[PDB]
Amino acid sequence: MKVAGVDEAGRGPVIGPLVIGVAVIDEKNIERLRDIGVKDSKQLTPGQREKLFSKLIDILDDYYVLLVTPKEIDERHHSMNELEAEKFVVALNSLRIKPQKIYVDSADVDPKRFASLIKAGLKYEATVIAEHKADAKYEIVSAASIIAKVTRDREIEKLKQKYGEFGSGYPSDPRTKEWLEEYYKQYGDFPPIVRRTWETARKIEERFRKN
């Protein structure tokens, strides 16, 4: 049967979109993912990882990427956990090759609940297997993780060419903190790439209010 994996990249940064990645393959060809070594991608330079990405795409029966913008994140009526689960559903419902078994990494949320959330949102019937650290346990989920990370890094590099060197985009990054402070000071607000709801951004805003 056809199986799918889903994972995301960019959950914690203040800069950039949240990327949902989906990978689809026939259970009979999982051997191929093991052979290319999808489980050891994080220990490779984005150079090798890009080559891994390219090999991945030719092997998978199908793959899908969904970019969730910072504006979408900031206007959410629920928590980030609920938001990631609904976007997992959006991407899964867009597949052209539907799977009967779906594996996902539940991250910090209870597995049974995260899985029920996705099963309830799916427009087609399938078994959803949610597990912590599924990205290390299941090849197809590791595959989805690579898709999401490579896609996200590509978008990041593209954004820096337009907005400049803003660091990693994470709140703890000194360069990121300075870039956001300088931007707000020069323009009086933030560009669309910033998640205004992130504490780091919100605080710079307040300080700007004469302080």
Strands (E), the chain: 2-9, 18-26, 62-68, 101-105, 127-131
8 is in an annotated binding site: yes
What are the respective helix, strand and coil percentages of the chain, to the nearest 5? 50, 15, 30
24 alpha carbon, distance to own chain's centre: 16
50 is in an annotated binding site: no
Q: What angle do CA 85, 136, 95 make, to 5 degrees?
A: 45
105 is in an annotated binding site: yes
Q: Residue 182 carries which side chain, given as an amino acid letter?
A: E
Binding residues: 7-8, 105
Residues at the binding site for a divalent metal cation are 7-8, 105
